[PDB]
Write an enzyme that holds these catalytic residues in place. Structure first.
Site, PDB file in Angstrom:
ATOM      1  N   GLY I  29       6.277   2.919   4.415  1.00 48.54           N
ATOM      2  CA  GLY I  29       6.787   1.580   4.712  1.00 48.54           C
ATOM      3  C   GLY I  29       5.746   0.620   5.261  1.00 48.54           C
ATOM      4  O   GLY I  29       4.595   0.998   5.489  1.00 48.54           O
ATOM      5  N   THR I  30       6.160  -0.627   5.476  1.00 46.88           N
ATOM      6  CA  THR I  30       5.273  -1.665   6.006  1.00 46.88           C
ATOM      7  C   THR I  30       5.034  -1.450   7.498  1.00 46.88           C
ATOM      8  O   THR I  30       5.777  -0.723   8.153  1.00 46.88           O
ATOM      9  CB  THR I  30       5.845  -3.085   5.795  1.00 46.88           C
ATOM     10  OG1 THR I  30       7.060  -3.238   6.539  1.00 46.88           O
ATOM     11  CG2 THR I  30       6.117  -3.356   4.317  1.00 46.88           C
ATOM     12  N   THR I  31       3.999  -2.092   8.030  1.00 44.72           N
ATOM     13  CA  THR I  31       3.619  -1.911   9.430  1.00 44.72           C
ATOM     14  C   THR I  31       4.519  -2.728  10.361  1.00 44.72           C
ATOM     15  O   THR I  31       4.754  -3.915  10.128  1.00 44.72           O
ATOM     16  CB  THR I  31       2.145  -2.298   9.673  1.00 44.72           C
ATOM     17  OG1 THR I  31       1.312  -1.656   8.698  1.00 44.72           O
ATOM     18  CG2 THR I  31       1.692  -1.881  11.073  1.00 44.72           C
ATOM     19  N   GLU I  46       5.157  -6.640   9.530  1.00 39.20           N
ATOM     20  CA  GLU I  46       4.544  -7.092   8.285  1.00 39.20           C
ATOM     21  C   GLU I  46       5.596  -7.125   7.176  1.00 39.20           C
ATOM     22  O   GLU I  46       6.262  -6.118   6.919  1.00 39.20           O
ATOM     23  CB  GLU I  46       3.396  -6.147   7.902  1.00 39.20           C
ATOM     24  CG  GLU I  46       2.868  -6.293   6.479  1.00 39.20           C
ATOM     25  CD  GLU I  46       1.899  -5.190   6.093  1.00 39.20           C
ATOM     26  OE1 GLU I  46       0.936  -5.483   5.359  1.00 39.20           O
ATOM     27  OE2 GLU I  46       2.091  -4.029   6.516  1.00 39.20           O
ATOM     28  N   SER I  74      10.229   0.770  10.217  1.00 43.54           N
ATOM     29  CA  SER I  74       9.458   0.946   8.993  1.00 43.54           C
ATOM     30  C   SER I  74      10.010   2.129   8.211  1.00 43.54           C
ATOM     31  O   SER I  74      10.375   3.147   8.798  1.00 43.54           O
ATOM     32  CB  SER I  74       7.989   1.192   9.328  1.00 43.54           C
ATOM     33  OG  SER I  74       7.447   0.102  10.053  1.00 43.54           O
TER      34      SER I  74
END
Ligand SMILES: [Mg+2]
Ligand SMILES: [Mg+2]
Ligand SMILES: [Mg+2]
Ligand SMILES: [Mg+2]
Ligand SMILES: [Mg+2]
Lengths: 226, 195, 250, 204, 244, 241, 231, 196, 243
Positions: I29-31, I46, I74
């Site tokens: 996943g995204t940060t 993010e 995330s």
């Protein structure tokens, strides 16, 4: 019914009369009102006799299982808590009014419990139709630091007040003494002040007095061999 | 409904039941048959609250017919009466009880004996030489107590039954429009078409 | 969630074996030896207190358990399974008997109830069988003294004397030579101690051996006086000292 | 309206020397109307006898229920139930219907087969046990029975003397009750023989 | 999820057989032999206890013969614990019937009921079947003396003489040879014991390895008596018939 | 080989899922120790905060179950907190129903019974934790009772749990072989904590700062945990003799 | 592979294959386009027939006067999800006298789809949805995936060959967002967008399906000769 | 019954009589109506003895479980739990409860929960059958930030009058003082308070 | 083998492989990050711009629980939403019974027990998210991070997703260089920088920054989104630091 409970030096005593009634009629002249919840936790019941009997037997059963589960001797507060929560749930429809007394590792205890689930603490208590007669005696003669002998005397005197003055109470006095560090001593028919006098006449009939139509042997034995 | 009578004689059971159906103000029918055949040699008459009577009778009929098919066997009158009693005893502590009283007349083919059972809506069962429900017994039992013999023929039973109905027609305030009479014996169930 | 294992985990194999029951019996075989001997005036049940660590207080772990005042039980196999069975056995003695008849169940019927519970864990959905064999000793008025074995399958058998677990085969042979129908309770205790010594490796004393009897009524253990008909429990667990006294006359 | 006095009837039980007696009337009625003179109210399961007064449908139901339960008891226990044990079973069974009870007045009578001790007991409709040494009464003429038994009874009566005492107690009590009578039965019970006697009485 | 671990106890094989029923029958073939023989004046039930011990308390022991009511008894072959579950259910059914109709339950009706319970475990629920076969010996006033058997499939059949458990093929052949319709109970007692003596896997047939029962109208007059034989009584009948 | 996935018997009469749950118990790499005094029960446990971004005050494996009962856990924190919440609920319910405080040994039995169920019922997995319950019981006095994933439990004079339990166990065994008594003969709990820390230092062969340890103390009518500064005072006293 | 037997199983790389297989059903489905300006929002859908005797499967479903969607994938699953949206829109109006916000409608669809991806016995939904609507914050377009992921967009396309229409909308972004107060031109842009996904077949009178919602325009679906104007 | 709770400078004090009646009969003349639900959170009970005991026991259980998870509960939180039980079960309960407690952050607080199950935070509260007779006296004599000795005198004098006029009230005057210093029980006998 | 095919099965190691596989979805996943400041907490995430067609500032990721708790996660976004929905039910029931808003440590355990429960059975799948959450209560500011296993601890700073290693290193510098503490406004600026720095692991597509905060002085202990001028100021500060 007259039941009392009295605290003393090293324990507690409970007592009760021995008359049970249906309305104005005496059903049993030597009833046993002192019930055992556990070896050293005893209680006396007033109100609906089946309910006090039933409730004592249920909580007594669960107390025994609890004692076995915890490897500890049963406590009076446990009997009290289980009784009151059961009775409260049934909203007074189980007509059990009890005085609960006993000894355990925590000490000696004396509680009352009412049908709706309320409980109380005291050094001296009375319940039943003869409770006012009994309480009059308790309020006149109770003091702090009673001995075992003084407490038994006071308790039985309070029951006697019920026996003689309350029509709902009569016959004999039963007592149970629960002392710390000792076996509880149940004293069935501790007093017997109401023995019936000899009748004026014998009412044994001559044999053959009653008219009979048919005689027959009743087979109580099981189906036989051969 | 109103009057249901029963008499057990030597070799048969006779059931008499009124024909009237009254809904308050008017008599809606004068030819109503207040009975159901439970099995070839067992008959049940009934009286009580409207609707519940026929509903209960047909429910019992269906159950006995089911038993007969399952086992290829006719239950004894005693066994049928016990089944009916239990159903009524169950019913009396229900949300809405069956308000139905019944007489069960049967001929036991095993014992070669007629049998009459009286059961009320509470599930109160008694085996009797003669019986009734409601006020019917109040008018008829004194006649039955006098004349009844256990060795009576079917014809003598019908004659004693006629005397009972005549007393009912004289002293009862309600017009029950006569009775349908049925006989239960070794040959089964038949209706007396002239009474 | 929800228990979605509504199917049997014990099933018949092509050879007719119920695998999980056989495997449960194998777990019992690995268990510490326990035994029971019936005398004319009593019954004795015994086992070794195999302490897992010397820092552990083995008195707090009870292998021999009171079920009713006149009935006791010992096991071989999985301890935790035994403990929960004792809880269920104590309760069922009340719910299915004492609350109905106002008296404690006879030995054979309590055994029958425990057996039923063990049978159901062999057929019900999403469970394994109990990994224990029980020995249940008891007394009741009309049947007298009795001793029963209960296995993982739910099967139970009455014994004059028997042994289960680790060294049961050797122990049963030892008991066959010594047992007769004229044994007094003290003789049965003596034979029990002799039999148990063979299967024990290390220390053999009152602190490492657990032993209880079903014998005479003990009014001193009743906790109250006044009712003549109530005379006290017949189940009594022997103390560490009482065991050691009989090990000198061994 | 009152369920315990629709059908009528009475039961009485007494203890004697190495014996017990239990007796009942034979009437079943619908209030004022007499319906049956053969409605026996005493039943037995092995050597334990049970009399039941009150609502007749419940009398029949409870007999069938206790026959059911004592038959299963015997199959499992491999012995006949004793009077003391059966008394507890009746009490338990009645109390389970605490808030929808059977309208009955049961009476247990019997001799313990092992101790030989005579035993009687009584219950209210809800299960409370009355275990009297002398006598137990039940039914629509219970007041009358209490009066008869209290004066006529003496302890340790021989079987044939106990028969006369209990018979006269029942008969005269029943004759002062509109809803009791129409015949009577007396059971004399010894350790291994039981005699049943039907009494002659007025039929009004 | 949980599907992974499901054995699926209630499915057909490609040949149209029920796996678990067949395997339960395989289990029962290793159980001690039980025999029932029906005569004109009664029924005999004989059964062999499985390899016993000298320390087994025989006089208080019961693994084969069980009383369902005063008129009906059963012989068990298979898992004893499974049998006791069904036996208790059968005892209750008999009492339910007696309470409902005020008559003793006819033998076949009891047999059909237990057999239907067995059937259910083969069609629904996902549970293993009961590893038990019964021989039912009973009497009622419709058909008189009756013998039935039921097995884990829930199928039941009536018999003049029948065996269940171990060596049924050999036992059934021996019974078929010596059985006659006009046979009496005392003759049937002898046949049952002789058949067990020949089919047994033990070296010799003794009293401590047997359970025995008779249902006779040898009850004084118009009634039926069940007799579960005591250890000494089995020892006597073994001497009488000349086996020991 | 599905007998290894769920809690059914293997051909050897073993429960592999239970055995593997015992292995999860050492996943945290933490050792705990418990001892009894005259009036108290002390439990100590290693504290490791490997990340600088962590709030060290929230890192704990000691739980206050009730006023009287404390619990230290050996195993992953999710299963630890699962057991902690349940123990707290059970202890509170016990007091409500039976009118007195739940004893340490009774709670241990209850949690052991729950664990037993997970070894018999297939849909529930065992918890990968060992639970050491401590208190000063009003009837039995100082008490240590320990539960494991098999559903086993027993009382202890003293005990140790973790990867290096054997070293600590033997060290404790040797001390009680000398003293010939079932407890630490000391009046104050402070000195019993000092004993516990000293003998852990000896057994593991490692020194401890105030942040390397976690301490729980049970006295009559209360269980409590020590702060870092309370532990520092303990460490100073050990070093000064 | 060994981890695609049910929705309750992660793969060793942390993938949910049953969900990915459900996503594949959308790619097999017929193309549908969504786009919006500041005043209106438009759906365009290419309907698919079984053969020349058959009808063309309907693609657009009305949820409320101010909201509706187009589908691509398993049509019965779209019926279930659209029924749920109808109920939720309806609950909002009856209980709160409030038109359901398009963003909140997306949140509800996400949560309903999620429950079918974490439990045993069930299966993921096998359909993708494009939801358009006009609420108190203007025109809106949402894209729903049965993984649970819901996204608010200016324009998009799902189904087979949807990449061509999506690239066109990405170029035209600055133009079609400015088409305010002109419904016909916004639909033209949508018809031109969906044309970038056609091969071999072209837009006919029973092939094309168009829907529009806006400032003073209830959600209405155009089929048959009503779309001949745009062919 | 006559019950009251009064906040003062150092915290809060609860007061009560000791009479419990069944009609005109005094079933208990030495009742303890001041009940502990937490260390420094107590309550005064009025209405059905069975109901208020049942409620108090349940609250004590809830706050014990709260403490094990979240630490010491506020007096507001205790009042909220009382209210939830009283409000949701208003059809089947007859309970009038005054909740009093001491925090260090909030100091002394008093909440009253009458029959309907509503909550009211007050500087002081009075309840029970005997309270009717002292509305006038209490309103005239209550001051905020009184001393411990003044607050004891205020409660003693108030309940003295309630006992004097209400037949359902009597016996001893029990009091529980809640401060930072701890928990102190007080008792006052008839010969003391009757001569005031 | 086969131990990794079913949830709640212990491997011979004593490991739950299904939970470890859920972590892989989180790492994909995204940060997202969290910073604990002097009187509150800051959350940042993010958001990858997959296409120009995404409406800016519309697809909001950070979620509020009650009025004082913020949550970010995330991994699988739907799983995170399911967890927050439960959290909202837990917070509501707590406030219903106890009146006071749920304390952050109390709330942490409610999420923890629920996530742990999804590791007990094979009929459910573990959560495919790591959740960073916290806020202000009566005892001050609290920051937590919760993993798929149900494991959670308190944090000074926290990070998860694809660029977690980069983020963690940046967070560790702030802890060392500010032992006295960080202000709420400083923490917003620093949060912007860290997300921009962590975007190097996702450098293919451009992104959108989203920040929220709860502070005793700046937001009255309520959760609010950073918007407009304060957001732009943080973006400018971040862009200046990467160049
Ligand atoms: Mg009369
Ligand atoms: Mg008359
Ligand atoms: Mg498990
Ligand atoms: Mg109330
Ligand atoms: Mg006063």
């Amino acid at each position: 019914t007259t039941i009392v409970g009295v605290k003393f030096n090293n324990g507690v005593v409970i007592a009760a009369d021995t008359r049970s009634t249906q309305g104005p009629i005496v059903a049993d002249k030597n009833c046993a009102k002192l019930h055992r919840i556990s070896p050293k936790i005893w209680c006396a019941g007033a109100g609906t006799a089946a309910d006090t009997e039933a409730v004592t037997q249920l909580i007594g059963s669960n107390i025994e299982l609890h004692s076995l589960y915890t490897s500890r001797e049963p406590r009076v507060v446990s009997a009290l808590q289980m009784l009151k929560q059961h009775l409260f749930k049934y909203q007074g429809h189980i007509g059990a009014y009890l005085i609960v007394a006993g000894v355990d590792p925590t000490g000696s205890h004396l509680f009352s419990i009412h049908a709706h689930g309320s409980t109380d603490v005291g050094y001296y208590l009375s319940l039943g139709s003869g409770s006012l007669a009994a309480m009059a005696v308790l309020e006149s003669h109770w003091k702090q630091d009673l001995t075992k002998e003084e407490a038994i005397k006071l308790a039985s005197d309070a029951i006697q007040a019920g026996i003689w003055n309350d029509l709902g109470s009569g016959s004999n006095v039963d007592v149970c003494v629960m002392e710390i560090g000792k076996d509880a001593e149940y004293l069935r028919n501790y007093l017997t002040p109401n023995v019936r006098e000899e009748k004026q006449k014998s009412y044994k009939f001559p044999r053959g007095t009653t008219a009979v139509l048919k005689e027959s042997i009743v087979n109580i034995c099981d189906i036989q061999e051969e | 409904m109103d009057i249901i009578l029963g008499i057990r004689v030597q070799d048969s059971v006779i059931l008499a039941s009124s024909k009237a159906v009254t809904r308050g103000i008017s008599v809606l029918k004068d030819s109503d048959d207040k009975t159901r055949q439970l099995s070839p040699h067992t008959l049940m008459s009934f009286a009580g609250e409207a609707g519940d009577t026929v509903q209960f009778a047909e429910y019992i009929q269906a159950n006995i017919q089911l038993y007969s098919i399952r086992e290829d066997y006719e239950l004894s009158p005693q066994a049928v009466s016990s089944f009916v009693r239990q159903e009524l005893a169950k019913s009396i502590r229900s949300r809405r009880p069956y308000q139905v009283n019944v007489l069960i007349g049967g001929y036991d083919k095993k014992k070669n004996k007629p049998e009459l059972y009286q059961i009320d809506y509470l599930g109160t069962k008694v085996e009797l030489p003669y019986g009734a429900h409601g006020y019917s017994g109040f008018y008829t039992f004194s006649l039955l107590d006098h004349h009844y013999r256990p060795d009576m023929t079917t014809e003598e039973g019908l004659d004693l039954l006629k005397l009972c109905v005549q007393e009912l027609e004289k002293r009862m305030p309600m017009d029950f429009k006569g009775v349908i009479v049925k006989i239960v014996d070794k040959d089964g169930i038949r209706q007396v078409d002239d009474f | 969630m929800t228990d979605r294992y509504s199917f049997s985990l014990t099933t018949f194999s092509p050879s007719g074996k119920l695998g999980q029951i056989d495997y449960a019996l194998t777990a019992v075989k690995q268990g510490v030896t326990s035994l029971g001997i019936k005398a004319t005036n009593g019954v004795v049940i015994a086992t070794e207190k195999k302490s897992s660590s010397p820092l552990a207080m083995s008195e707090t772990l009870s292998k021999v358990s009171l079920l009713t005042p006149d009935i006791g039980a010992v096991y071989s196999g999985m301890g935790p399974d035994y403990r929960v069975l004792v809880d269920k056995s104590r309760k069922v003695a009340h719910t299915s008997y004492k609350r109905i008849y106002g008296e404690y169940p006879p030995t054979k019927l309590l055994v029958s109830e425990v057996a039923k519970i063990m049978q159901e864990a062999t057929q019900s959905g999403g469970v394994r069988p109990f990994g224990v064999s029980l020995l249940i000793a008891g007394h009741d008025e009309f049947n007298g003294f009795s001793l029963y074995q209960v296995d993982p399958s739910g099967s139970y058998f009455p014994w004059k004397a028997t042994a289960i677990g680790k060294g049961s085969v050797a122990a049963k042979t030892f008991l066959e030579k010594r047992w007769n129908d004229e044994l007094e309770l003290e003789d049965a205790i003596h034979i029990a101690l002799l039999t148990l010594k063979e299967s024990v490796e290390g220390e053999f004393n009152g602190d490492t051996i657990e032993l209880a009897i079903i014998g005479d009524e003990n009014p001193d253990l009743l906790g109250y006086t006044g009712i003549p008909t109530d005379k006290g429990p017949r189940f009594r667990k022997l103390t560490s000292q009482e065991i050691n006294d009989r090990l000198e006359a061994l | 309206s009152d369920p315990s006095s629709i059908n009528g009837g009475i039961v009485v039980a007494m203890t004697g020397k190495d014996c017990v007696a239990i007796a009942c009337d034979l009437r079943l009625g619908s209030q004022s109307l007499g319906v049956s003179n053969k409605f026996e109210k005493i039943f037995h399961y092995g050597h334990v006898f049970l009399g039941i007064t009150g609502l007749a449908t419940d009398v029949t139901t409870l007999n069938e229920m206790f026959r059911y339960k004592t038959n299963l008891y015997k199959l499992k226990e491999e012995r006949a139930i004793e009077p003391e044990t059966f008394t507890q079973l009746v009490s338990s069974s009645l109390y389970e219907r605490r808030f929808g009870p059977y309208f009955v007045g049961p009476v247990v009578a019997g001799i313990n087969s092992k101790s030989g001790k005579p035993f009687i007991a009584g219950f209210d409709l809800i299960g409370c046990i009355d275990e009297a040494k002398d006598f137990i009464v039940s039914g629509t003429a219970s007041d009358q029975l209490f009066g008869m038994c209290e004066s006529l009874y003496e302890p340790n009566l021989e079987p044939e003397d106990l028969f006369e005492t209990i018979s006269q107690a029942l008969l005269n009590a029943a004759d002062r009750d509109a809803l009791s009578g129409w015949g009577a039965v007396v059971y004399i019970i010894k350790k291994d023989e039981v005699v049943k006697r039907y009494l002659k009485m007025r039929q009004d | 999820g949980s599907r992974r671990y499901d054995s699926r106890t209630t499915i057909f094989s490609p040949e149209g057989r029920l796996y678990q029923v067949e395997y339960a029958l395989e289990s029962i073939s290793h159980a001690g032999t039980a025999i029932g023989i029906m005569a004109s004046d009664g029924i005999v039930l004989a059964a062999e206890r499985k390899v016993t011990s000298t320390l087994l308390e025989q006089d208080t022991s019961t693994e084969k013969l069980y009383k369902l009511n005063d008129k009906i008894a059963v012989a068990v072959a298979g898992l004893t614990a499974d049998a006791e579950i069904l036996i208790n259910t059968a005892r209750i059914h008999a009492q339910n019937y007696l309470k409902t109709y005020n008559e003793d339950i006819p033998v076949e009706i009891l047999v059909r009921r237990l057999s239907d319970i067995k059937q259910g475990y083969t069609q629904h629920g996902g549970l293993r079947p009961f590893g038990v076969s019964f021989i039912y010996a009973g009497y009622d006033d419709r058909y008189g003396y009756q013998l039935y058997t039921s097995n884990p499939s829930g199928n039941y059949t009536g018999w003049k003489a029948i065996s269940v458990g171990a060596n049924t093929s050999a036992a059934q052949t021996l019974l078929q040879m010596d059985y006659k319709d006009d046979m009496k109970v005392d003759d049937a007692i002898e046949l049952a014991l002789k058949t067990l003596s020949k089919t047994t896997d033990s070296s010799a047939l003794t009293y401590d390895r047997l359970e025995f029962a008779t249902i006779r109208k040898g009850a004084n007059d118009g009634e039926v008596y069940q007799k579960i034989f005591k250890p000494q009584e089995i020892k006597d009948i073994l001497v009488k018939t000349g086996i020991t | 080989g599905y007998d290894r996935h769920i809690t059914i018997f293997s051909p050897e009469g073993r429960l592999y899922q239970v055995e593997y749950a015992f292995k999860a118990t050492n996943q945290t790499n933490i050792n705990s120790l418990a001892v009894r005094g005259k009036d108290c029960t002390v439990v100590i446990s290693q504290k490791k905060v490997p990340d600088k971004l962590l709030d060290p005050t929230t890192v704990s494996y000691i739980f206050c179950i009730s006023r009287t009962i404390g619990m230290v856990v050996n195993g992953p924190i999710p299963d630890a907190r699962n057991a902690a919440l349940r123990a707290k609920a059970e202890a509170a319910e016990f007091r409500y129903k039976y009118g007195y405080d739940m004893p340490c040994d009774v709670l241990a039995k209850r949690m052991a019974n729950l664990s037993q169920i997970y070894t018999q019922r297939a849909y529930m997995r065992p918890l990968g934790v060992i639970l050491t319950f401590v208190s000063v019981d009003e009837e039995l006095g100082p008490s240590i009772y320990k539960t494991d994933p098999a559903g086993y439990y027993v009382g202890y004079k003293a005990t140790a749990t973790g990867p290096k339990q054997q070293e600590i166990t033997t060290n404790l065994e040797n001390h009680f072989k000398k003293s010939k008594i079932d407890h630490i003969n000391e009046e104050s709990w402070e000195k019993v904590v000092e004993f516990a820390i000293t003998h852990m230092i000896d057994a593991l062969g490692t020194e401890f700062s105030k942040n390397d340890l976690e301490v729980g103390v049970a006295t009559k009518d209360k269980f409590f945990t020590l702060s870092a500064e309370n532990i520092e005072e303990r460490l100073v006293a050990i070093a000064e003799q | 592979n060994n981890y695609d037997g049910d929705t309750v199983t992660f793969s060793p790389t942390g993938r949910l294959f049953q969900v990915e297989y459900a996503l594949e059903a959308i790619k097999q489905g017929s193309v549908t386009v969504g786009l919006r300006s500041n005043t209106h929002a438009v759906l365009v859908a290419l309907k698919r027939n079984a053969d020349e005797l058959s009808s063309y499967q309907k693609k657009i479903i009305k949820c409320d006067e101010h909201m509706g969607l187009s589908l691509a994938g398993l049509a019965p699953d779209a019926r279930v999800l659209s029924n749920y949206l109808r109920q939720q829109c309806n609950y909002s109006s009856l209980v709160f006298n409030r038109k359901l916000a398009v963003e909140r409608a997306g949140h509800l669809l996400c949560d309903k789809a999620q429950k079918n991806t974490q439990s045993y016995g069930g299966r993921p939904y096998g359909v993708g949805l494009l939801i358009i609507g006009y609420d108190k914050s203007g025109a809106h377009l949402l894209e729903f995936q049965p993984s649970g992921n819901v996204t608010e967009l200016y324009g998009t396309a799902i189904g087979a060959r949807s990449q061509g229409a999506k690239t066109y909308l990405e170029r035209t972004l600055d133009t079609f967002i400015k088409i305010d107060g002109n419904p016909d031109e916004l639909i033209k842009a949508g018809v031109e967008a969906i044309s970038q996904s056609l091969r071999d077949e072209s837009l006919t009178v029973d092939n094309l399906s168009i829907a529009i919602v806006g400032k003073d325009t209830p959600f209405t679906i155009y089929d048959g000769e009503a779309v001949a104007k745009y062919i | 019954t006559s019950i009251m709770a009064v906040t003062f400078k150092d915290g809060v004090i609860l007061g009560a009589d000791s009479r419990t009646t069944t009609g005109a009969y005094i079933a208990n003349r030495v009742t303890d109506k001041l009940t502990r639900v937490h260390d420094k959170i107590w309550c005064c009970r009025s209405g059905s003895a069975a109901d208020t005991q049942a409620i108090a026991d349940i609250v004590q259980y809830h706050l014990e479980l709260y403490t094990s998870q979240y630490g010491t509960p506020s007096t507001e939180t205790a009042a909220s739990v009382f209210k939830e039980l009283c409000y949701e079960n208003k059809d089947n309960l007859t309970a009038g409860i005054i909740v009093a407690g001491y925090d260090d952050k909030n100091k002394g607080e008093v909440y009253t929960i009458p029959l309907g199950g509503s909550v009211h935070k007050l500087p002081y509260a009075i309840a029970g059958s005997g309270s009717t007779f002292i509305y006038g006296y209490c309103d005239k004599n209550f001051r905020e930030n009184m001393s411990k000795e003044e607050t004891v005198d205020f409660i003693k004098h108030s309940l003295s009058q309630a006992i004097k006029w209400d037949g359902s009230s009597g016996g001893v005057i029990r009091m529980v003082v809640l401060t930072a210093a701890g928990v102190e029980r007080l008792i006052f006998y008839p010969d003391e308070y009757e001569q005031l | 083998t086969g131990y990794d095919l079913s949830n709640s099965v212990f491997s011979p190691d004593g490991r739950n492989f299904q939970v470890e596989y859920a972590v892989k979805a989180v790492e994909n996943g995204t940060t997202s990050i969290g910073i604990k400041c002097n009187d509150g907490v800051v959350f940042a995430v993010e958001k990858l711009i997959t296409s120009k067609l995404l409406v800016p500032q519309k697809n909001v990721k950070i979620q509020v629980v009650d009025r004082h708790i913020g949550c970010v996660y995330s991994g699988l976004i739907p799983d995170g939403r399911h967890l927050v929905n439960r959290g909202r039910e837990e917070a509501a029931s707590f406030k219903k019974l106890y009146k006071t808003p749920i304390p952050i440590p109390a709330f942490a355990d409610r999420l923890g027990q629920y996530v742990q429960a999804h590791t007990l059975y094979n009929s459910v799948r573990p959560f495919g998210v790591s959740t960073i959450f916290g806020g202000v209560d009566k005892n001050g500011a609290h920051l937590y991070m919760l993993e798929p296993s149900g494991s959670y601890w308190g944090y000074k700073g926290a990070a998860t997703g694809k660029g977690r290693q980069s983020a963690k290193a940046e967070l560790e510098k702030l802890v060392d260089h500010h032992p006295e503490g960080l202000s709420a406004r400083e923490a917003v600026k620093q949060a912007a920088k860290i997300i921009y720095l962590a975007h190097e692991d996702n450098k293919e597509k451009d992104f959108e920054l989203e920040i929220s905060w709860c502070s005793l002085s700046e937001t009255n202990g309520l959760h609010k989104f950073v918007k407009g001028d304060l957001l732009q100021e943080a973006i400018d500060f971040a862009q200046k630091e990467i160049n």
